[PDB]
């Protein structure tokens, strides 16, 4: 063993992998933000209704802890329809407003009549 | 009363050095094997201007004899050096202007600059623009060397410390008057906030020991001893004499 460098530093020791004897909370914390809690309210106002005909786009009110991917997955797992893109804004009352554009194969009027708006 | 202007320099609040635009500290190479048992060639790439310094900085690149890498250092540019001139450093380097070598190698009367107090502190003495030291009185036993400093003082130093041969470039900088307040403002703004220069008689009694009264008079003897407390040392500090000079120094 010849130490050519004039600086002595730490040896690369064996860091032990964590293997605990017992779990710390007995159970995984369940997903509170699931598909029925992300997408809360469809918006049935005048401009949001006009977007259905003139935009091929549904309008929803979403909890603020969700993003575009979770809104897209929630729509595809609840309504079984394809999503082009989701534009999210924050409505100044405190909720998120999501504009979900659908596929050209689907009809926003038919999806709105099936969901009841 | 109120804290005087002389005590506020130690706070470091607004009296620091304007040090951002300065390119770096001008030091020599730290001492190693090649600078004590030989010499090594270095190439000066350019010379630049350090703000707050009238002396030019010299960017001399070296070669590392241990790992393959070109080391860039910052020397004080001596007078008459040019870009591309091979700067030589070490013990047995041949004496030319711009070559740094220990003072035991050079003969007496050699005009050098950027010398060292202790051997191995990368250059302390005689660093201002246009100043030099005079090397005299070598000693084989008890390795010491007398140097005449620019203040006229003769200091006995070691014989192993290094010094670049020549004078510092930029000599005669105090030949031109500043000639207006504007160039003084720009000069001191480049250096450091050292210019709130207000007369101590003109300022208040509660802020300076001299000022006040119906007339602008000092009132107290300005020669104030070295044993004075902080805030008392205004005007002449430990003045052994005053008035117009007679002779050169008359001090051994």
């Amino acid at each position: 063993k010849i130490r050519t460098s004039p600086t002595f530093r730490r040896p690369k020791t064996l860091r032990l992998r964590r293997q605990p004897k017992y779990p710390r909370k007995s159970a995984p914390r369940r997903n509170k933000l699931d598909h029925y809690a992300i997408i809360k309210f469809p918006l049935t106002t005048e401009s949001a209704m006009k977007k259905i005909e003139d935009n091929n786009t549904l309008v929803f009110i979403v909890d603020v802890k969700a993003n575009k991917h979770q809104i897209k997955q929630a729509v595809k797992k609840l309504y079984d329809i394809d999503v082009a893109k989701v534009n999210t804004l924050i409505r100044p009352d405190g909720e998120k407003k999501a504009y979900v554009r659908l596929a050209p194969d689907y009809d926003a009027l038919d999806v709105a009549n099936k969901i009841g708006i | 009363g109120r804290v005087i202007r002389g005590q506020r320099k130690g706070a470091g609040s607004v009296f620091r050095a304007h040090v951002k635009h300065r390119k770096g500290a001008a030091r020599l190479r730290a001492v190693d094997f090649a600078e004590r048992h030989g010499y090594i060639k270095g190439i000066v790439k350019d010379i630049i201007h350090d703000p707050g310094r009238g002396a030019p900085l010299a960017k001399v690149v070296f070669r590392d004899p241990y790992r393959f890498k070109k080391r860039t250092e910052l020397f004080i540019a001596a007078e008459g050096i040019h870009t591309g001139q091979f700067v030589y450093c070490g013990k047995k380097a041949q004496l030319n202007i711009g070559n740094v070598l220990p003072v035991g190698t050079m003969p007496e009367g050699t005009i050098v600059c950027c010398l060292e107090e202790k051997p191995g502190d990368r250059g302390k003495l005689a660093r201002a623009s246009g100043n030099y030291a005079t090397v005299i009185s070598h000693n084989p036993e008890t390795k010491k060397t007398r140097v005449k400093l620019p203040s006229g003082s003769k200091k006995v130093i070691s014989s192993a410390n290094r010094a670049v041969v020549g004078v510092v470039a930029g000599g005669g900088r105090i030949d031109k008057p500043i000639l207006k307040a504007g160039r003084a403002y720009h000069k001191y703004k480049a250096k450091r906030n050292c210019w709130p220069r207000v007369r101590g008689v003109a300022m208040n009694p509660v802020e300076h020991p001299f000022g006040g009264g119906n007339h602008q008079h000092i009132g107290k003897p300005s020669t104030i001893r070295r044993d004075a407390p902080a805030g008392r040392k205004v005007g002449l500090i430990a003045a052994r004499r005053t008035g117009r000079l007679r002779g050169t120094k008359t001090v051994q």
Partner: protein, 234 residues
Amino acid sequence: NPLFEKRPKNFGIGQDIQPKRDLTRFVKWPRYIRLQRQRAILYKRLKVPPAINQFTQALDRQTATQLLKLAHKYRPETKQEKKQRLLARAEKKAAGKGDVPTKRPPVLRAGVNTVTTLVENKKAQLVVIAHDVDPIELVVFLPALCRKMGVPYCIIKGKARLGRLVHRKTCTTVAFTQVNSEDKGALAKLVEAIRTNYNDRYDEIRRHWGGNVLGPKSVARIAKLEKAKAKELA
């Protein structure tokens, strides 16, 4: 033979770079490395008292090997064979209903309190004193006490080797008190050698001071000045 040229490199100043040397005496060692090294150098430089200069003046390795060969078969029992002897003697006495199956068990004593009690009561035939005890105050009273009580003591180097004959990390002291008939002559020869080495020279070691050895650079400097002084005289 076809091309196979030699490419020499010159390793001087101002040319091709230096090779990777050993660099042992120039690596920046950490705090505790420097502390133990200059601690050993500090014990080498400074004058030690004549009660702790007895250390490093110890027994040679041949007589220490003889002492270890004597002490190997007076080994105190560990936990495994201790429990084995307890359970085996209990089963033999429960089977045979015997009163006194064991006449005399020979076993050495360890520990500074036990050894000090045995030398104060003159039960110790021989004392083995370890060298590597870092508080020396735990040890410094034992040689004079063994001398004034007449029990021979031997200073030995390595407390780990003395702990491995008692199945422990540190042992610091070994008291030979009981000897067998096949070992009495060998212990008498060892006690004679140890009384020749230590107790007969106790008045010599107690007077001499240890240490006072300068560093080799300063020793070579004084030797160069002495050769210059001889050049001045001749």
